[PDB]
């Protein structure tokens, strides 16, 4: 066999890629469907919807993928609880470990699908099934916010000592500035009031290091 | 209701105790607020009060 | 022996061996946190001038001495009012200038 | 009061319980015109005797357009969790043909039957791994049992009602002749009959009406703010609507334990693998799915 | 039914069963509930031979149907005591009963706890005919014959030889259990999360596992896994 | 991060399990604007005590 | 009280709440509902 | 529809064949009778004529 797993979403909504930083220091990845108010569960926090600043429409299509991973394919991709006439998926079977042979009950046949014909002595085999390819194929692939749970929040002398300045105002990234500090404790910093552009959120180790952050201004203050 | 289940009901010295005492067990709505201290009476249990 | 086999508990990105895996009833306790809080507080209300009538605009100078994040309703004057600003943030020293037709 | 109408005291039945001050008991019907907003209307009482009489003051305060809660339902925040106990064959001894009957509440497989933190999650077998890779040395495949939870760790609850109408109504304060003052909100555009004490107020003139689409109110229990939506609602959760889980006890609206609230067939995303099943979901949050306004 | 054999029936009750070095001899002895009687002679002080003709074929447990009971190959915590894996301990007054079962004609029941495993006893002739802690004298139990009448075990526990985990791995489970149960603060007096004042009467039932450390671990989002491999001990 | 929003620490319940370093447990809701792609957004936590 | 007289299905306006039910009605008086004359 | 054994067995009903029914259920600390599962409510309707 060459096995394909399929799902009929029949929709398209924007979504993104998110990496997360627990205050402890954990980093866990996931993909939130932030166009839909989906709630992905992990640890203590959950992220949810954003702004659908652009949307588009598309016909009834959905994805076809192969287990050996030949490539990825797209089709009209009709799917339901049963195999309707003339669709891409006739045998719809629900166990990969039992997807090599046909032994699990979950997967469901078609009435009079197989071509048995008789003779004067004995019967011969034929079929009317169609392969996934070249039967109905229409293409071939070449305000983020979060809710807080019951957190596990945890809990001296320190000098700033800047060193240099870079160049950006009114560019979508901002200019990058480097500061060389030292502190006897592991800590986090906070905003400069007169910087007048954005806040601060730096974190340091107990040595002399530098951590550089991005900002933009007309004139340095 | 409070009953010794042997020689009938509890005593007045007993039922008055069993609104202050901590050994006579009972069902719920009697332990959340009235405080069944649930003395582990393996033998000869004190008189139980229910609804 | 007629046994199913060894047990391994995998629980949220971990692989752990149980010495004894089991279920049992336990004696526990529960807690409660009382709901509700209340607020009131003097406010300065004064009127510089008035041009009420049919015209929507009026000059009213009222204030608030409070810190609450959520601001409640407001009310109306005689002859059938409904101020377009009934709820307005009450955290800081922000005066409120309403409009009427009184 | 500027507009004032006296009673019709022709109904006369007074018992002289005391001679210094009389007593009487009467009823009837009255028709007083609507007063302008911000003012109170009166109602005069008369007795065949001269010296004593009373009054009743009806004060209006506001004119607005609200609609009556024909129903009421709560909505928790659903999450999809799923477990998997993976026996293998001759070791779980589970039937060669998976039993088509499934006990959806007990699950004797893992600790007999107890309270289930899911609201009627489903059951099933699966395909079977068998051989040296899964390691329990039997050739024939192995059934796997799976759960799905609809859960709510820290909910934010919304109560909703589909009036699907808009009729004028007002604000009324009332003055019993004794001296009582009881408030209430009459839906005086509709001939509703609010009950209190002895009197009941009813309909007024709908001197202006307007039309509006199928919308109704969404409110939050912590009271974040107030929200509006198309707000479809019925006895069941129809496809693509705002409210899927419709649950009828606030004290039981934190968890999912009361029977009154009703699930969706195959709503939770259980998918299998060669070892064990993983969780997904297709539910939609109330916000940004079908939202046509936001209250200032 | 029997792991190996049906346990012997010897009329003369006054006999103390001795030690054996053999591995495949003590299991059928464990099938006979021999070990639990030794606990009485050690803590209850009674020479009560327990469960004639009973074995593991008639013993009953509080949950109505126990799949683990069907499997005699698995091992129950009170039977982890003969083999030296775990040891059951006495009961303190601050420890309380669970009002679940019908405590009629008992002398020894188990209750797994957050810390360890607890066993309770009464006197010989002190029949247990009520759920209370008080034990009641009666001559109706003079005969030692009882089909697990005095032996009723709470819970459905599986046990096995185990290999430990590092200390930090233990600390990960302890914190994660705290997060999943925001409401739960106090259990058995042992702190789970420090909170404000708490009520008392509430029985509590979640699954648990032990990995060789002091604090028990509970779960609601767990996935198990069943592997059987040829181990010389498992023969 | 260029866009940054601090928490609402008005929910205060901290148990002094240790004196040298404190402990606290809190929850809530937050509304942070969407950041441009390729950059990270922050979220600041505050405590009534100063240093940490 | 006599059986001879005959009701209407779901004519009376019962509606529920979270505690208890309240009364309403949809019946119409004989007058001013469909009246085409009035005898002098 | 005629007796209503719930409230005083069966007697003369001042309604002409009013209906019957259960309802949805309040349950919890708010309604105060401490059971989790909901509560049925029984209702009458009168068609009446004072004067
Ligand atoms: C009740 O008390 C009994 C005596 O205090 C005790 O018998 C003792 O059992 C231990 C079991 O470990 C024996 O210890 C020796 O033998 C085992 C194997 O049998 C070895 O592995 C040990 O290393 C050790 O050498 C003791 O010898 C034995 N006592 C006597 C006098 O022989 C019971 O086990 C106790 N029962 C309970 C339930 O606590």
Author numbering:
A (entry chain B): 155 to 296, 320 to 332, 344 to 409
B (entry chain A): 257 to 307
C (entry chain A): 308 to 409
D (entry chain B): 1 to 296
E (entry chain A): 22 to 256
F (entry chain B): 1 to 52
G (entry chain B): 257 to 296
H (entry chain B): 104 to 154
What does the paper say about this structure?
SFTSV has three single-stranded negative-sense RNA segments (L, M, and S), and belongs to the Phenuiviridae family within the Bunyavirales order. However, the virus shell of SFTSV consists of only lipid bilayer envelopes covered with capsomers composed of transmembrane glycoproteins (Gc and Gn) that lack a capsid. The M segment of the virus encodes a polyprotein precursor that is sequentially cleaved by cellular proteases during transport to the endoplasmic reticulum (ER) to become mature two glycoproteins, Gn and Gc. Gn and Gc assemble into a heterodimer on the viral surface, with Gn forming a capsid spike and the Gc portion located below, closer to the lipid membrane.
The glycoprotein shell was organized into three types of quasi-equivalent hexons (peripentonal, edge, and central) and pentons. To further counteract the effects of conformational heterogeneity within the large capsid particle, we optimized the reconstruction by using the “block-based” reconstruction (BBR) and in situ single particle analysis (isSPA) methods. Sub-particles around the 3-fold, 2-fold and 5-fold axes were re-extracted for BBR. Within the local refinement on each region, we obtained a reconstruction of the 3-fold axis region with a resolution of 5.6 Å and a reconstruction of the 2-fold axis region with a resolution of 5.9 Å. The BBR method relied heavily on the initial translational and rotational parameters obtained from the icosahedral reconstruction. However, the structure of SFTSV may deviate largely from the symmetric structure as indicated by the 2D class averages. Thus, these parameters of many of the virus particles from a refinement with icosahedral symmetry were incorrect, which led to a limited resolution of the reconstruction from the BBR method. To avoid using these parameters and further improve the local resolution, we processed the 3-fold axis region and 2-fold axis region with isSPA methods. Using maps generated by BBR as templates, we re-searched globally the locations and orientations of the sub-particles with isSPA. Finally, the resolution of the 3-fold proteins was improved to 4.5 Å, and the resolution of 2-fold proteins was pushed to 5.18 Å, respectively.
